[PDB]
Amino acid sequence: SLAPEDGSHRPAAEPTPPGAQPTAPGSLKAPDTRNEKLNSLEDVRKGSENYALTTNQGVRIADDQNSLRAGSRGPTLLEDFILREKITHFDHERIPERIVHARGSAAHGYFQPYKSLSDITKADFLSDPNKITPVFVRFSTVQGGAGSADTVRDIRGFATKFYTEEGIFDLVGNNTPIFFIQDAHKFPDFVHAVKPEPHWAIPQGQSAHDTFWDYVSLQPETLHNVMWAMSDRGIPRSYRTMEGFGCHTFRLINAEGKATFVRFHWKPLAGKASLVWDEAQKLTGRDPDFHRRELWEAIEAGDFPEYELGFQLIPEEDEFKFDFDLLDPTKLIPEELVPVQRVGKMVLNRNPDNFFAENEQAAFHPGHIVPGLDFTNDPLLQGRLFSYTDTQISRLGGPNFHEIPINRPTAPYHNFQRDGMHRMGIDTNPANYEPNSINDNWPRETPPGPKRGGFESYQERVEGNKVRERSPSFGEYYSHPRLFWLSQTPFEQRHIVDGFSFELSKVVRPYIRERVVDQLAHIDLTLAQAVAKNLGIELTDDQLNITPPPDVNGLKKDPSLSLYAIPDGDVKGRVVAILLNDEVRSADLLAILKALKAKGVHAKLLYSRMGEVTADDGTVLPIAATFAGAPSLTVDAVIVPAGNIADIADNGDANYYLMEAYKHLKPIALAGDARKFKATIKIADQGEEGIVEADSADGSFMDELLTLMAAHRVWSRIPKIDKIPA
């Protein structure tokens, strides 16, 4: 026995807050959580306790510490098959990563609709509020490799595999409502431009380089999604606090054969929240795994990520009722014009067991639809249809990638396809073709119908010549970027300006920055001048006189496009740093922790070293991390209780902890002599909004602090920060 006698090696198999226990595989942490899909993976789950160590051929190994050699200082012999099997498996562990979205984090869960949608769709998973559908959801970035950082500025993917009783439906979305380009033929061009440059393979996880901004400057269709990426949307706080969108117009098809256009939405029930750029960037260094870690620890805590599925619905006969083409994936449909109708709730409640087997090998593809759904002619969606099947043949080693356990339908699947590399299923059908008599033609086709019917495409009318031609209706590039911009708060606009400004300062060829500034002046002059000023560029008289683009169907803003215009904060599962000292005042700490617990807010107790400290009244306080070990970047607010403040008053790290938190607009709360730290962030004796302070940590000290956390960040502090050296 190598395990410690007290069993402190094994994580408690029960919900525990982040940091309290080591993390564990899902089926060990949460054995009582189940769903149909998790149940069906049991046949491939492999345990370990009380088993002998073997080869893959089931032969017990006696010595797993040494190779076979001719004498104990001799050459290794070719007959050591135990060595070669173990080294061969290791030698071939890696598979190609995804072309895009290589970096991502996944969890199991379930979905249920609020009511039957049988009036608008015959999709079985939406037919009955008691029907529960297991899901597997992978969130991701786009540009960087599987080993790149989480808190980059980038679009995020949000892909949901629904294991329905009528097939797999994959909803393969992103965290913005549009894309950079219109036609799929340009996808390798765009992706090449944003990816690391081909001579030197720099930069990782970043659009802040020449080729990306060259492409944007030469393809104004990209401006709409670029505005989103340059906004704080590009740097979410958590996968739990971002929106999801299906990107395209799809169709719902009802039992009667009626088609309704649909765009898919995910609403985060934890609310919308993003980092700020300095924070996000430093965080890629302090913890490049932050969002992966946060997702996993949320689920281990019982802070289950929850999302409401919603549909924007447009009748067929309303196809041309807008200023923009519904099929144009660079156009959003404003919620002011077409409301999101709520459809159901998805809850992610179990982590995987093995990240490679379940997460890296999962394959999601938007052509995986089910009867009651269908496509449209969106020419980006159209080409996606080819890519997501094709790419699996190298990534997952061939055409049996549906037999990889995570990818298996829970619905029955039977057909006449055979063979391929890694073939698992052993077909007993005397026939591998149809029509056949020798098995009475089974498995048999099934006519379309209201439920459990075969898939038939909606008989959309097609008329025109075979052309490689962009629709004239897609030839408008500025009005949606402008609607987005005008829908942002003044501080969200500031962050957009600083996004473009920082990124363009990393473009080495000046003309490319000038070209991009010219594009911005076709969107909004204020935006354009503000970026220009940061780049030392002066707008020409002609640029000053560019007529703004028209509003979008009469709208001059839509507040649903703003992260923050309409409060939707939720403090459950946020985290607070508590800065300890060698003699904490216990009455302050009890009050703090009691208030945080009651709202589901976590805490981490920090000090200048590991171990424990002791409060005035003798309570032993265990330390979670050092100031340097768990920086303010990783938390939502900072509280400093009273006591022996002198112990940390000249600690560089403790001071800088409050400076970095202050700079990043986080709430800060100071009790009694911890008010001494006001000097380091230059707060006046009268105090300021966003800094909570009092003689002791209650009456209303915690309610104040928690009100501030509900509003996420202290935007009014923005003017004060530039003067702090942090």
Residue that is written with structure tokens 């789950």 in the block? 45
Strand partners, 134: 110
Binding of ligand HDE by 136 (CB under 6 A): no
- Chain residue whose CB lies nearest ligand HDE: 247
Exposed, middle or buried: residue 472 (CB in 10 Å: 0-12, 13-18, 19+)? exposed
Tell me which of a second copy, ligand HDE, ligand [S], none is bound by residue 72, counting a contact when its beta carbon lies within the kind-specific cut-off of 5 to 8 angstroms: a second copy
Tell whether residue 172 is a contact of ligand HDE (CB under 6 A): yes
Residue 395 within binding range of a second copy, rule CB under 8 A: yes
Per rule CB under 6 A, is residue 391 in the interface with ligand HDE?
Answer: yes
Query: Of all residues in this chain, which one has the CB nearest to ligand HDD in the complex?
Result: 157
- Using alpha carbons, list the distances in angstroms from residue 71 to 78, 274, 344: 14, 62, 68
Minimum distance of a second copy from residue 531's CB (angstroms): 10
From 236-244, 358-366, 522-530, 619-627, span contacting ligand HDE (CB under 6 A)? 358-366
Q: Which is nearer to ligand [S], 247 or 714 (by Cβ)?
A: 247
* Nearest CA-CA partner of 563 in 123, 234, 321: 234
> CB 661 → a second copy: shortest distance, Å?
12
The minimum distance between CB 225 and ligand [S], in angstroms, equals: 8
CB 596 within 8 A of CB 625: no
Residues in the interface with ligand [S] (CB under 6 A) total 5
Q: Could you tell me the two tokens for 335? A: 């919620």
Given 35, 174, 225, 349, the catalytic residue: 174
Region of 52-60, 93-101, 319-327, 592-600 interacting with ligand HDD (CB under 6 A): 93-101
- Report the distance separating Cα 295 and Cα 137, nearest Å: 11
Of the candidate residues 18, 329, 499, 690, the single one contacting ligand [S] (CB under 6 A):
329
157-164 vs 167-174, strand pairing mode: antiparallel
Q: What letter does residue 245 receive in the DSSP assignment? A: E
Which residue, 126 or 275, has its beta carbon nearer to a second copy? 275
Tell me the CA distances in angstroms from 437 to 395, 418, 431, 433, 440, one per residue in order: 38, 19, 9, 10, 5
Q: Is 388 annotated as a binding residue?
A: yes
Asked if 480 is part of the footprint of ligand HDD (rule: CB under 6 A), the reply reads: no
The residue among 434, 444, 506 whose CA lies nearest residue 277 is 506
Size of the chain in residues: 726
List the alpha helices (DSSP H) in 319-391: 379-390
Q: Which stretch binds ligand HDE (CB under 6 A): 347-355, 359-367, 557-565, 700-708?
A: 359-367
Size of the site for ligand HDD (CB under 6 A): 28
Q: How many CA atoms lie within 13 A of 409 on its CB side?
A: 15
> By C-beta, is 18 or 329 nearer to ligand [S]?
329
Give the whole-angstrom CA distance, residue 252 versus residue 121. Answer: 5
Beta strands 306-315 and 244-245 are unpaired
Provide the token pair at 540.
């020409």
Which of the following is catalytic: 35, 101, 108, 664? Answer: 101
CA dist., res. 555 & res. 334, Å (int): 9
Q: Distance between CA 500 and CA 726 in Å, rounded? A: 22
Q: Does 301 bind ligand HDE (CB under 6 A)?
A: no
Q: Is 285 in the site for a second copy (CB under 8 A)?
A: yes
- Residue entry with tokens 């169709």: 251
Known active-site residue 101: yes
Q: Which of residues 83, 337, 711, 718 is near a second copy by CB under 8 A?
A: 83
- x/- string (CB under 6 A) for ligand HDD, residues 243-262? ----x---------------
Q: Provide the mask over 188-227, with x wherever binding to ligand HDE is found by CB under 6 A and - wherever it is not.
A: ----------------------------------------
Pick 381 or 697: Cβ nearer ligand HDD = 381
* 74-82, 334-342, 383-391, 689-697 -> range binding ligand HDE (CB under 6 A): 383-391
The sign of the CA dihedral 691, 693, 698, 701 is negative
**Segment contacting ligand HDD by CB under 6 A, of 167-175, 227-235, 276-284, 463-471:** 167-175
In whole angstroms, the minimum distance from the beta carbon of 361 to ligand HDE comes to 10
Q: Give the x/- contact pattern for ligand [S] in 234-253, rule: CB under 6 A.
A: -------------xx-----
Contact 343, 310 (CB under 8 A): yes
Give the whole-angstrom CA distance, residue 314 versus residue 334. Answer: 12
Q: Does 354 bind a second copy (CB under 8 A)?
A: yes
Q: Which of residues 196-215 bind a second copy (CB under 8 A)?
A: 196, 198-205, 210
- Helix axis angle for 510-521 and 490-505, nearest 10°, is 150
Residue 178 in the binding site for ligand [S] (CB under 6 A): yes
Query: Rounded to whole angstroms, how far apart are CA atoms 166 and 257?
Result: 18
Instruction: Give me the least distance between CB of 481 and ligand HDD, in Å please.
Output: 17
Binding ligand HDD (rule: CB under 6 A), the pick from 91, 542, 689, 722 is: 91
> Out of a second copy, ligand [S], ligand HDD, none, which partner does residue 506 contact, by CB within 5 to 8 A per kind?
a second copy
DSSP 630-695: S-GGG-SEEEE--B-GGGTTT-HHHHHHHHHHHHTT--EEEEGGGGGGGGGGT--TT--TTEEEES
Packing angle of the helix pair 490-505, 525-534 (nearest 10 deg) = 40
Residue 144 as a binder of ligand HDE (CB under 6 A): the answer is no
Q: Looking at 275, 363, 613, 661, which residue binds ligand HDE (CB under 6 A)?
A: 363
Is 172 a binder of ligand HDD (CB under 6 A)?
Answer: yes
Least Å from the CB of residue 148 to ligand HDE:
14
Check residue 101 for interaction with ligand [S] (CB under 6 A): no
Would strands 133-140 and 157-164 be described as parallel, antiparallel, or unpaired? antiparallel
663 contributes a contact to ligand [S] by CB under 6 A: no
Bridge partners, 510 (sequence order): none
Please say which residue, 182 or 529, places its beta carbon nearer to ligand [S]. 182
Count Cα atoms within 13 angstroms, Cβ side, for 231.
27
Rounded Cα gap, residues 140 and 94, in angstroms: 19
Nearest approach in angstroms of CB 665 to a second copy is: 14
CB of 195 to a second copy, least distance (A): 9
The 10 Å Cβ neighbour count of residue 645 is: 22
Spacing of C-alpha 503 from chain mean position: 22
Distance CA 672, CA 659 (A): 19
List the single partner that 178 binds among ligand HDE, a second copy, ligand [S], none, CB under 5 to 8 Å by kind.
ligand [S]
CA angle 593–293–602, rounded 5-degree value: 5
Q: Which of 125, 136, 187, 485 binds ligand HDE (CB under 6 A)?
A: 187
Residues in the annotated binding site for heme: 388
- Point out the annotated binding site: 388
Active-site annotation, residues: 101, 174
Binding site for ligand HDE (CB under 6 A): 91, 98-101, 104, 138, 140, 157, 159, 172-174, 179, 184, 187, 247, 362-364, 380, 383-384, 387-388, 391
Which chain residues interact with ligand HDD by CB under 6 A? 87, 91, 98-101, 104, 138, 140, 157, 159, 172-174, 179, 184, 187, 247, 329, 362-364, 380, 383-384, 387-388, 391
